[PDB]
Amino acid sequence: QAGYDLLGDGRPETLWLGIGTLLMLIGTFYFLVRGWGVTDKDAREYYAVTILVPGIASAAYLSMFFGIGLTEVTVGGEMLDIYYARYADWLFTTPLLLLDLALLAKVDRVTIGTLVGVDALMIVTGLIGALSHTAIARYSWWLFSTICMIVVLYFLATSLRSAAKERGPEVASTFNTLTALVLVLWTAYPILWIIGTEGAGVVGLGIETLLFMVLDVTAKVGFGFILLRSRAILGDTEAP
Numbered sequence: 001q002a003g004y005d006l007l008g009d010g011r012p013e014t015l016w017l018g019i020g021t022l023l024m025l026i027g028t029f030y031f032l033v034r035g036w037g038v039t040d041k042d043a044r045e046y047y048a049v050t051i052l053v054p055g056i057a058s059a060a061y062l063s064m065f066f067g068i069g070l071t072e073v074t075v076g077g078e079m080l081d082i083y084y085a086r087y088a089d090w091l092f093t094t095p096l097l098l099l100d101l102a103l104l105a106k107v108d109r110v111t112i113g114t115l116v117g118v119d120a121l122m123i124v125t126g127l128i129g130a131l132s133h134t135a136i137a138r139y140s141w142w143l144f145s146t147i148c149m150i151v152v153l154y155f156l157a158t159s160l161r162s163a164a165k166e167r168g169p170e171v172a173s174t175f176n177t178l179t180a181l182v183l184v185l186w187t188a189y190p191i192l193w194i195i196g197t198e199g200a201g202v203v204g205l206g207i208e209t210l211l212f213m214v215l216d217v218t219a220k221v222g223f224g225f226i227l228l229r230s231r232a233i234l235g236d237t238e239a240p
């Protein structure tokens with residue numbers, strides 16, 4: 001695969017996992033240090049949620065770097081690598097990101113339950129797809145997971161956006177900037193999966209790991225940077 005076998009264990013993709021580790025740790029430490037001077041009760045909740053997003057990803061990237069949680073899946077005459085930590089990362093961090101958006105929009109706990117329940121189903125079915133042993137199952141679960149993603153994004157774009165609007169310009173501008181980011185970045189994930197090693201196999205694991213790493217850093221550290229610099233996080237929140 002495209003990269004460089006840093007640890008001398010036959011995995012050129014560790015180059016990208018190492019860089020990803022470093023960027024996630026630096027982002028975590030930046031937000032943490034910026035958080036220590038924050039007193040407002042709402043801002044503290046946003047910081048707490050948001051620090052954990054690159055924080056948990058840091059742990060997942062480090063695990064992947066060292067080869068912890070790596071195994072192979074047999075698909076006919078081919079053995080696909082799967083890093084379990086990647087899915088565990090997304091299972092925890094995607095609800096956290098949605099929770100940030102739901103706090104901005106100030107929506108009810110039933111709406112949040114729906115959003116995060118569909119998000120969890122998306123990640124689980126993606127994992128089932130990655131572990132499946134025939135191409136028909138892989139594409140099927142991928143499609144299922146993708147329809148779940150559209151439902152999440154549809155809710156962000158319609159119901160949560162409408163709610164944020166009622167909260168005035170500071171909140172609605174921040175909500176709309178972040179939602180613009182999410183709609184684009186999150187859609188990139190199923191596209192990479194299907195053209196990469198898990199699907200059609202056009203790109204190999206090296207390029208795939210690199211691109212997931214860029215997406216992950218943008219979706220976590222980039223998102224965090226946009227949110228935490230906004231005056232909107234000082235406004236009232238109601239936790240679920």
Ligand SMILES: *C/C=C(C)/C=C/C=C(C)/C=C/C1=C(C)CCCC1(C)C
Pocket residue numbers: 057090093094097122123125126127142145146149186187189190193216219220
């Ligand atoms: C911290 C990283 C973020 C924001 C991760 C997002 C991940 C996804 C939107 C993943 C989506 C997938 C599908 C919709 C289908 C194939 C399986 C996944 C999990 C790659």
Ligand SMILES: CCCCCCCCCCCCCCCC
Pocket residue numbers: 003004019023213214217
């Ligand atoms: C012989 C060693 C080869 C090393 C190749 C280094 C190329 C530069 C890597 C930069 C990766 C993109 C970072 C993306 C930032 C989010």
Ligand SMILES: CCCCCCCCCCCCCCCC
Pocket residue numbers: 023026027030217218221222
């Ligand atoms: C205003 C000072 C900025 C310092 C931020 C430090 C964080 C370093 C992590 C780099 C990751 C870049 C992600 C951005 C992608 C759009």
Ligand SMILES: CCCCCCCCC
Pocket residue numbers: 004019
């Ligand atoms: C042989 C050592 C190569 C190390 C690659 C680091 C790339 C810079 C981020």
Ligand SMILES: CCCCCCCCC
Pocket residue numbers: 028032051052055056059
């Ligand atoms: C003080 C909080 C550190 C950042 C969260 C790390 C999470 C460990 C898995």
Ligand SMILES: CCCCCCCCC
Pocket residue numbers: 059060062063066
């Ligand atoms: C949660 C990060 C994992 C660190 C374990 C390192 C062990 C080296 C083989």
Ligand SMILES: CCCCCCCCC
Pocket residue numbers: 150153154157183
């Ligand atoms: C596939 C993304 C769902 C959003 C559709 C509505 C467009 C509003 C920006």
Ligand SMILES: [Ca+2]
Pocket residue numbers: 040041042043233234235236
């Ligand atoms: Ca406040």
Ligand SMILES: [Cl-]
Pocket residue numbers: 037038039040043
């Ligand atoms: Cl403050």
Ligand SMILES: [Cl-]
Pocket residue numbers: 039040041042
């Ligand atoms: Cl306060």
Ligand SMILES: [Cl-]
Pocket residue numbers: 001002203204205206207208
């Ligand atoms: Cl490759």
Ligand code: NA
Pocket residue numbers: 004005006007008009010011012014
């Ligand atoms: Na290596």
